[PDB]
Design an enzyme around this catalytic site. Structure first.
Site, PDB file in Angstrom:
ATOM      1  N   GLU A 285       0.819  -1.205   0.000  1.00 21.84           N
ATOM      2  CA  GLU A 285       0.000   0.000   0.000  1.00 21.84           C
ATOM      3  C   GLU A 285       0.856   1.260   0.000  1.00 21.84           C
ATOM      4  OE1 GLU A 285      -3.307  -0.411  -0.381  1.00 21.84           O
ATOM      5  OE2 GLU A 285      -2.902  -2.562  -0.420  1.00 21.84           O
TER       6      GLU A 285
ATOM      7  N   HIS B   9     -16.699 -10.844 -10.908  1.00 17.77           N
ATOM      8  CA  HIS B   9     -16.328  -9.878 -11.937  1.00 17.77           C
ATOM      9  C   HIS B   9     -17.257  -9.959 -13.137  1.00 17.77           C
ATOM     10  CE1 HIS B   9     -12.959 -10.495  -9.326  1.00 17.77           C
ATOM     11  NE2 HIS B   9     -12.197  -9.598  -9.928  1.00 17.77           N
TER      12      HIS B   9
HETATM   13 CL   LIG Z   1      -5.718  -2.739  -2.682  1.00 12.34          CL
HETATM   14 ZN   LIG Z   2      -3.246  -2.869  -4.003  1.00 11.44          ZN
END
Ligand SMILES: [Cl-]
Ligand SMILES: [Zn+2]
Ligand SMILES: *[C@@H]1O[C@H](CO)[C@@H](O)[C@H](O)[C@H]1NC(C)=O
Ligand SMILES: *[C@@H]1O[C@H](CO)[C@@H](O)[C@H](O)[C@H]1NC(C)=O
Ligand SMILES: *[C@@H]1O[C@H](CO)[C@@H](O)[C@H](O)[C@H]1NC(C)=O
Ligand SMILES: *[C@@H]1O[C@H](CO)[C@@H](O)[C@H](O)[C@H]1NC(C)=O
Ligand SMILES: *[C@@H]1O[C@H](CO)[C@@H](O)[C@H](O)[C@H]1NC(C)=O
Ligand SMILES: *[C@@H]1O[C@H](CO)[C@@H](O)[C@H](O)[C@H]1NC(C)=O
Ligand SMILES: [Cl-]
Ligand SMILES: [Cl-]
Ligand SMILES: [Cl-]
Ligand SMILES: [Cl-]
EC number: 3.4.17.23
Length: 587
Positions: A350, A480
């Protein structure tokens, strides 16, 4: 006052209004996700509605500047990002119906239950950990029928309406529409046609075929040891035995496929607790890692405004790890960090996102994003790659300096990585090709399911346990598909990831196998990476990739480099065994 000059002025006003509104909306969303309350949900929804209305009216205005009179490619890119028409080309009744269809498919997927258990967590637990053929088979068939049978007619209408929208926007189909997300025009030496994506995906897949075939033969043998009578040694693999509900990743097959089950994996969680680490320390170490390659520190605001631990019973928070770029120089991470190795690596991932965000923050609002849909997550993944290598854990004091390596443990780790990465690549390509073919009109409804499983047999070597007719909708049994997302992004991102890692380790003068590489302390690799991150969405993604790897195109060779020890070890294991599969077999 030319059209291009008018458009420049318009974009100026747009940027200044948009940054403010986007900040207010992002802050409302943050206040909700870190403090779940009705007041905060209403604020978030109101701000998001205001943002959507702003974008609606601004797109209407943007459409009044004809692109064919814009010569400046940056102005053109921004105007284009605004001038997307999409579903609005459909009549009010057709768009209403399509949105009703999309909502209905999403709701029945999320609320679907088989009798009663719901996909998360029940059936997922069964498909991850159950070793009973009958239980797994039941769950697989149950979801396919209970949910797919409902989704089938909705999906047919969805296909019709989406293709109408795509051709109304001058695309060949909805698949061509999606392939537009890789298109590049007007930049000589860097252009990329929507058809080129298919050709290149099929080229790189032709190159991945041998490694996947050998992993397939290995996993088939091991599953045979796990499932005596049920598997043929020249046939495809039963779909309900692949470790999750679809065989998207083979990760949970590790228990049944670990090459050296007596050799444990490296798990420094115990070392992280014994040295009394906390979330602050984890994120500071990730920050140090990024500083090591010449990238900047996290902003003071980041440390002041982030949420890096669960706030406890005092208030509820959305604990999914996420990186936030609110604009106006405001960067944060939301993470309910626990002192665990997985959370260490996810923190690195992140913060890699954050570094990306910070790099292109000087670009116009509409050009602040990854070079294409796959770039960001690749940037994230390569950080966790470098963080997990034994070299790095020794360097940062999580492994004892004399910790001796082992080929058996390394091959275990490489197998797991294959089960996920290599495993999902044929799955992803096959799924998206089936969808491309349905949108293009090459698969009549009468052969829909048939072609699906035919492809499952030929491309990915997987067979259905029960004969399925055209009353089902097995592709729609995945989120999806039923929620209207493109899927090829996973193929391209996975390939970009290892292209990046190979190029950067090369710049870091790394010697030896690619999987043992740590880019730490390399300003050469950092510089190579930043030269791409800073562009955001302003340049062709072909050029963004060239800035990192020196070539303008997707290439699977680095992934094969990463896996070459495992490829060779597999070829050694399978030398006296059949490799490949016959499409004729059926359980
Ligand atoms: Cl993510
Ligand atoms: Zn990610
Ligand atoms: C969470 O939201 C409520 C309602 O808006 C507010 O009263 C409370 O102060 C918030 N908590 C924090 C920590 O800001
Ligand atoms: C395109 O316009 C931007 C301003 O909107 C300017 O910064 C840039 O230099 C222009 N590009 C060319 C090639 O003139
Ligand atoms: C949006 O629609 C207008 C006509 O209503 C069209 O001229 C314009 O080209 C469309 N946008 C794009 C990106 O094609
Ligand atoms: C990064 O931050 C640390 C403190 O956390 C500081 O000592 C160091 O000088 C900073 N370096 C840069 C390049 O920002
Ligand atoms: C990078 O240099 C630092 C000193 O600033 C050192 O502590 C660390 O072990 C080095 N890591 C590698 C992989 O060379
Ligand atoms: C580990 O790999 C090295 C180099 O290929 C080899 O010489 C050694 O015999 C291997 N040892 C084990 C236990 O696999
Ligand atoms: Cl922004
Ligand atoms: Cl992946
Ligand atoms: Cl399926
Ligand atoms: Cl992705």
């Amino acid at each position: 006052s030319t059209i291009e000059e008018q458009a420049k002025t318009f974009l100026d006003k747009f940027n200044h209004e948009a940054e403010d509104l986007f900040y207010q909306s992002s802050l409302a969303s943050w206040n909700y996700n870190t403090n779940i309350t009705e007041e905060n949900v209403q604020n978030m929804n109101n701000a998001g509605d205001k943002w959507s209305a702003f974008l609606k009216e601004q797109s209407t205005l943007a459409q009044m500047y004809p692109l064919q009179e814009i010569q400046n490619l940056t102005v053109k890119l921004q105007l284009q990002a605004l001038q997307q028409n999409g579903s609005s080309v459909l009549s009010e009744d057709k768009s209403k119906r399509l949105n009703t269809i999309l909502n209905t498919m999403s709701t029945i997927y999320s609320t679907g239950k088989v009798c009663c258990l719901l996909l998360e967590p029940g059936l997922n637990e069964i498909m991850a950990n159950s070793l009973d053929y009958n239980e797994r088979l039941w769950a697989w068939e149950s979801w396919r029928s209970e949910v797919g049978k409902q989704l089938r007619p909705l999906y047919e209408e969805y296909v019709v309406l989406k293709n109408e929208m795509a051709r109304a926007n001058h695309y060949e189909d909805y698949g061509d529409y999606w392939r537009g997300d890789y298109e590049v025009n007007g930049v000589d030496g860097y252009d990329y046609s929507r058809g080129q994506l298919i050709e290149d995906v099929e080229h790189t897949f032709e190159e991945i075929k041998p490694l996947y075939e050998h992993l397939h033969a290995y996993v088939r043998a091991k599953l045979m040891n796990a499932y005596p009578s049920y598997i043929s040694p020249i046939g495809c693999l039963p779909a309900h035995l692949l470790g999750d509900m679809w065989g998207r990743f083979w990760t949970n097959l590790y228990s049944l496929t670990v090459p050296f089950g007596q050799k444990p994996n490296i798990d420094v969680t115990d070392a992280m607790v014994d040295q009394a680490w906390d979330a602050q320390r984890i994120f500071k170490e990730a920050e140090k890692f990024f500083v090591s390659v010449g990238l900047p520190n996290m902003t003071q605001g980041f440390w002041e405004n982030s949420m890096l631990t669960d706030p406890g019973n005092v208030q509820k928070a959305v604990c999914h790890p996420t990186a936030w770029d609110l604009g106006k120089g405001d960067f944060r991470i939301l993470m309910c960090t626990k002192v665990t190795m997985d959370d260490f690596l996810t923190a690195h991932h992140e913060m890699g996102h954050i570094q990306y965000d910070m790099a292109y923050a000087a670009q116009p609002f509409l050009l602040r994003n990854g070079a294409n849909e796959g770039f960001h997550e690749a940037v994230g993944e390569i950080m966790s790659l470098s963080a997990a290598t034994p070299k790095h854990l020794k360097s940062i004091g999580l492994l004892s300096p004399d910790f001796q390596e082992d080929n058996e443990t390394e091959i275990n780790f490489l197998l797991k990585q294959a089960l996920t990465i290599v495993g999902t690549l044929p799955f992803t390509y096959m799924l998206e090709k089936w969808r491309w073919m349905v949108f293009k009109g090459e698969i009549p409804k009468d052969q829909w399911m048939k072609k699906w499983w035919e492809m499952k047999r030929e491309i990915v070597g997987v067979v259905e346990p029960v004969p399925h007719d055209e009353t089902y909708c097995d592709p729609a049994s995945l989120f999806h598909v039923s929620n209207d997302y493109s899927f090829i992004r996973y193929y391209t991102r996975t390939l970009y990831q290892f292209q990046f890692q190979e190029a950067l380790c090369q710049a870091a003068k790394h010697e030896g196998p690619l999987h043992k590489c740590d880019i730490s302390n390399s300003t050469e690799a950092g510089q190579k990476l930043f030269n791409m991150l800073r562009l955001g969405k302003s340049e062709p993604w072909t050029l963004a990739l060239e800035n990192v790897v020196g070539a303008k195109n997707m290439n699977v060779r680095p992934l094969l480099n990463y896996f070459e020890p495992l490829f060779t070890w597999l070829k050694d294991q399978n030398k006296n065994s059949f490799v490949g599969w016959s499409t004729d077999w059926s359980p």
